[PDB]
Amino acid sequence: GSVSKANVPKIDVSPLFGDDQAAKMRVAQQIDAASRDTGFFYAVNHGINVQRLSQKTKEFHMSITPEEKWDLAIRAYNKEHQDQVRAGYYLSIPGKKAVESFCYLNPNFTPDHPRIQAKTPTHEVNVWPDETKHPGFQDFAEQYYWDVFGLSSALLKGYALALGKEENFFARHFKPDDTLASVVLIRYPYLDPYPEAAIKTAADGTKLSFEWHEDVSLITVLYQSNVQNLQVETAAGYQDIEADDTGYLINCGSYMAHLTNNYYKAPIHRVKWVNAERQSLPFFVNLGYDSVIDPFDPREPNGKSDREPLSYGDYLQNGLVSLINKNGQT
Ligand SMILES: CC(C)[C@@H](NC(=O)[C@H](CS)NC(=O)CCC[C@H](N)C(=O)O)S(=O)(=O)O
Ligand SMILES: [Fe+3]
Numbered sequence: 001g002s003v004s005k006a007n008v009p010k011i012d013v014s015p016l017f018g019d020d021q022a023a024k025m026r027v028a029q030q031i032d033a034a035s036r037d038t039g040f041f042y043a044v045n046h047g048i049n050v051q052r053l054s055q056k057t058k059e060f061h062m063s064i065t066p067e068e069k070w071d072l073a074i075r076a077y078n079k080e081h082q083d084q085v086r087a088g089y090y091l092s093i094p095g096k097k098a099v100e101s102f103c104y105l106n107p108n109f110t111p112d113h114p115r116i117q118a119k120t121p122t123h124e125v126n127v128w129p130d131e132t133k134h135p136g137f138q139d140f141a142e143q144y145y146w147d148v149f150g151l152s153s154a155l156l157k158g159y160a161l162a163l164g165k166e167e168n169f170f171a172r173h174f175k176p177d178d179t180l181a182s183v184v185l186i187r188y189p190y191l192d193p194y195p196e197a198a199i200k201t202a203a204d205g206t207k208l209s210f211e212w213h214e215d216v217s218l219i220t221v222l223y224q225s226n227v228q229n230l231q232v233e234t235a236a237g238y239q240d241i242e243a244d245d246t247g248y249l250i251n252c253g254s255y256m257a258h259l260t261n262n263y264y265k266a267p268i269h270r271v272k273w274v275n276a277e278r279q280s281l282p283f284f285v286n287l288g289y290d291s292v293i294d295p296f297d298p299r300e301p302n303g304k305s306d307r308e309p310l311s312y313g314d315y316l317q318n319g320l321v322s323l324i325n326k327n328g329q330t
Contacts, residue, residue, distance in 0.1 A: 001205075006038045006232050006239035010247060014045040016154035028161035035162065035252060038232050038239070039267030042247035043155060043221075048147050050223050050246065056140040057279055060102070061187040064089075064129060072102070072127050076329050086182065086320070087124045090330055092189070098198040099209065099330060101186040104128075106179050107142045115178070120289055121317050122180055145183055148283040149176065152221050155250060156285070159219065163260065163298055170218065173291040173312075180286035180316055188229075190277040199273045206231075206238070207273040211327050214266035216319035217253030217284040218312075224249065227278040233268040241269075253284070255315055261297040261305045289313030 011030045015023035034041035072089040075081045081088065092100035104126045109116055115123040128138045153171050160169035174181075188209065191198075200208040212233065223245075224230075230241035230249075241249070257266040271280075287293075295307035324330070 003231075004236070004239045006040065006234070006241050008038065008040045008042055008241055008249075009034055010042045010044045010244070012045045013043045013151075013155060013158065014047070016158050017047070024157070024167070025161055028158050031155075031158045032162035035159075035264040038234065039265055040232055040241055040249060040251045040269075042244050043151070043250050044247045046151050046248055048151055048248070050248075052140075053144055053223060053281065054225060054245070054279060056137065056144075057185050057281060060129075060134060060137050060185065061100075061279075063134065068129050068133065069100075072129060074103075083124060084127065085124065086122065087126050095195045096197050098189055098191055098194070099186060100189075101184050101330065103182055103184045104141060104145070105182050106176070107145060108177055115289065120313070122289065122313055122320075141183070141185075145181075145283075146176070148183070148221055149174075149179070149181065151248065152181070152219070152283060152285045155219060155221065159252075159256075159264075163264070163296075164303075170293070173287040173293065174218075174285065175288060178288035178291075180289060180313065182284050182286065184280075184282050184284075186280040186282070188274075188276075188278045188280065190275060192275075194273075194275045202270065204237070206270075208270055209273045210271040210330075212268050212270040213323060213327055214257070214268055215251060215253035215284070216255075216316065216323055217286060218255045219285045220249075220251050220253055221283040221285060222249040222251075223279075223281045225278045225280075227274055227276045229272045229274050229278070231270050231272060233270075238270065254319065255287075255293075255310070255312065258307060258310055258315075259293045259295045261295060261299070261307060263298045286316055287312040289316075 069089050074084040074088040077091045090101040156170040157167040226243050226245040228243040231238040252264050254266040291312040292309045295305040296303045297305040
């Protein structure tokens, strides 16, 4: 019943920001090898100040009041906010639900934006706390969105080259004016006593905070504090993913698995229950609402696939609802 440790290589992604094309191919090879193995890798030498990200996120989580949480709550917690399906605060439920979080979307989604004017699903205008009660928080959060957007764009060039495509194969659909990408600022608290109602038990007996799932994304670009919790499923069972609070943990989402005919799988993973204060800050790399990538199969000589091209917006709307139905309202 022992638990092994997943091979999660640390990949220096800095060449993806430069113009050394052979060096970028050597990064792409590493991304290919990781994507074909466990499906996770750590992006290092990424150029983002993750210490400031963790400090500002901690300041926000530890200073917001129950009044402000109701005022920012998504409609799952506040019936007055029917437009907040994605963005807003996700309340914990003491004695029942430990996790709480704050999700925000593309800062360019304003009342002027045509997708907001047309009321297209998955598009929302971000809600923010009072500036004086949380000085600099909105500025930090929006800046972080574009900081990790820049990193994610380079990572997408690595994935494109790894699959034998031109480096903009994915990134050309990843644009500041229409990206459905999201940031979630997740707090997992220390609780004494920790309520067993907030703990799930896996089929193999492991105590979990969040059950197995594939990510709803093209790729996921995640920062976490230094508390080990993640497990990836392999054919030989679940394996622990070691923590690293200096790098970004990268993995493919189910849209990537669809478009590559499962050549780059969306790794199934789950979150172990750990009674420790920690943060989990995912950036879900989503494309535009009408973004469509023609599927292909890198295993076939002609590279042809019979899978239907999937519009990303419909994929995202269906995927987020299915994840809530399967693993519960977060
Ligand atoms: C329970 C929770 C803390 C987990 N984190 C996540 O983000 C999970 C697993 S990937 N994903 C979501 O809840 C989709 C969010 C989409 C976002 N609202 C949007 O609209 O884009 S946990 O894995 O850390 O346990
Ligand atoms: Fe996930």
